Amino acid sequence: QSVLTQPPSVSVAPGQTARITCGGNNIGSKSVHWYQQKPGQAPVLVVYDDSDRPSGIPERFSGSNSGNTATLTISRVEAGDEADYYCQVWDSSSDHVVFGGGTKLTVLGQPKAAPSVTLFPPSSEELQANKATLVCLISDFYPGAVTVAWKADSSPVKAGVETTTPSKQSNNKYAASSYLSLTPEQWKSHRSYSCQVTHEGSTVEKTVAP
Amino acid sequence: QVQLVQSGAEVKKPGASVKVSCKASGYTFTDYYIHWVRQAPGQGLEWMGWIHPNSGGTNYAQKFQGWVTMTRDTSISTAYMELSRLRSDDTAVYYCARGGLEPRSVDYYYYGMDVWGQGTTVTVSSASTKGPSVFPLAPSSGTAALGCLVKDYFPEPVTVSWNSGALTSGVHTFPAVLQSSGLYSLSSVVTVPSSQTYICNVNHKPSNTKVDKRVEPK
Numbered sequence A: 001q002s003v004l005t006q007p008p009s010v011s012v013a014p015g016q017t018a019r020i021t022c023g024g025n026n027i028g029s030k031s032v033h034w035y036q037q038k039p040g041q042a043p044v045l046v047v048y049d050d051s052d053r054p055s056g057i058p059e060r061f062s063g064s065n066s067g068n069t070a071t072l073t074i075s076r077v078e079a080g081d082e083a084d085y086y087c088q089v090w091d092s093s094s095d096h097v098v099f100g101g102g103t104k105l106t107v108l109g110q111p112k113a114a115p116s117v118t119l120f121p122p123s124s125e126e127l128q129a130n131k132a133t134l135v136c137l138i139s140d141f142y143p144g145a146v147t148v149a150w151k152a153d154s155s156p157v158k159a160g161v162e163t164t165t166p167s168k169q170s171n172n173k174y175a176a177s178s179y180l181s182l183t184p185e186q187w188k189s190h191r192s193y194s195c196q197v198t199h200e201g202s203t204v205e206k207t208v209a210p
Numbered sequence B: 001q002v003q004l005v006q007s008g009a010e011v012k013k014p015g016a017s018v019k020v021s022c023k024a025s026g027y028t029f030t031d032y033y034i035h036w037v038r039q040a041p042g043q044g045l046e047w048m049g050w051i052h053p054n055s056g057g058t059n060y061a062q063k064f065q066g067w068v069t070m071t072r073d074t075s076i077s078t079a080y081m082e083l084s085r086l087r088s089d090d091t092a093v094y095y096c097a098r099g100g101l102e103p104r105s106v107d108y109y110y111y112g113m114d115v116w117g118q119g120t121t122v123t124v125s126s127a128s129t130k131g132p133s134v135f136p137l138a139p140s141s142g143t144a145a146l147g148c149l150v151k152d153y154f155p156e157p158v159t160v161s162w163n164s165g166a167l168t169s170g171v172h173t174f175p176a177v178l179q180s181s182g183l184y185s186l187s188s189v190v191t192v193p194s195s196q197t198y199i200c201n202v203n204h205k206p207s208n209t210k211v212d213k214r215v216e217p218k
Helices: A124-128 A184-189
Strands: A009-011 A018-023 A033-037 A044-047 A061-066 A069-074 A084-091 A096-099 A103-106 A116-120 A133-141 A147-152 A161-163 A174-181 A193-199 A202-208 B003-006 B010-012 B018-025 B032-039 B046-051 B058-060 B068-073 B078-083 B092-101 B120-124 B133-137 B147-153 B171-173 B184-190 B199-204 B209-214
Touching: A009 A018, A018 A084, A018 A103, A044 A061, A069 A084, A096 B046, A116 A193, A116 A202, A124 B133, A133 A147, A133 A193, A133 B147, A133 B184, A147 A161, A147 A174, A174 A193, A174 B184, B003 B092, B010 B018, B018 B092, B018 B120, B032 B068, B046 B068, B046 B092, B058 B068, B078 B092, B133 B209, B147 B199
Parallel strands: A009 A103, B010 B120
Antiparallel strands: A018 A069, A033 A044, A033 A084, A061 A069, A084 A096, A084 A103, A116 A133, A133 A174, A147 A193, A161 A174, A193 A202, B003 B018, B018 B078, B032 B046, B032 B092, B046 B058, B068 B078, B092 B120, B133 B147, B147 B184, B171 B184, B199 B209
């Protein structure tokens, strides 16, 4: 059988031009298709039959395929063009359809954005239920790297902490969440609890108390 | 309104099996092959195989042939896919996509997969379906906090709205965290004007759990 190969990741400044390649043996005579997949969504066919574009796709997405390489060229790339790009052929030899391994596209050049932090204490409902859980909710930040520190009385706390990976919102910026589980006591024992998140060297803190 | 709608998330024990459905509408079902693509979490796309909605003939990727079974019922334009003897490796999103024109032809009239299902998440686990606790997250406070914490549930997913679809904007529902326990937990919270009973409609279908929770300031 045949196997398609792509570079795992490709980077471009905004407004510049991105070239994504799809290597295969005599792929120049196979007809390549391209998909764009953004997190938690279905792929979208962006180019097919080597270089045809479905209705609704802009001419800035073009394609070519010759020899041992097909190429997806995206002109004037926008931040909205970050996705995984998959090439694909029908291989008559095996009678199988084959995907490339995918290419991450990143548009390094977006604006810095600081985390909005919101924090809640335990419910009495929860405490009467003999439990206690704190909720720190980081939103609206770029880039997608953020570190979260939990403080009780100016001391750090490790156990009970569960932090999500930076997910991606509608506004193409990121969001995460940390969850602090404690016994009803430890909550009542301490003067306060604070969730501090650091992004690009600056730190944003919020505090809560019984 | 050319469309493929797949059935909802499933959870099976290892060794079990699953049938997933994909319903076509907005075009003649028997005009295009139906394909299935696997995508495990964090992985890429894998072609599983296809089926002729007209004849019922099938074609399977090496990796998937033998323990996977694709069928169909033209009378309702639905493609089915069965996965037998499931293991943990099988946990994934499964798509149906529509690609390739009938009839056969010496050269495949295949122009890529132009229409896609929304995917079906199949989770393979021996864990028992458990309902979430839902606690109120009163606001402190301009804009206010207020929210709802859905705690220690299994399994994904869970669908929260606010005040029966009424309160939409401002509603931010966060992507869940996986706890050590094996249970998920997420929160939905509404920023609001400081200056109206606020209720969050939480519903965890897989455990037949639906709580309503009023969030009042302490």
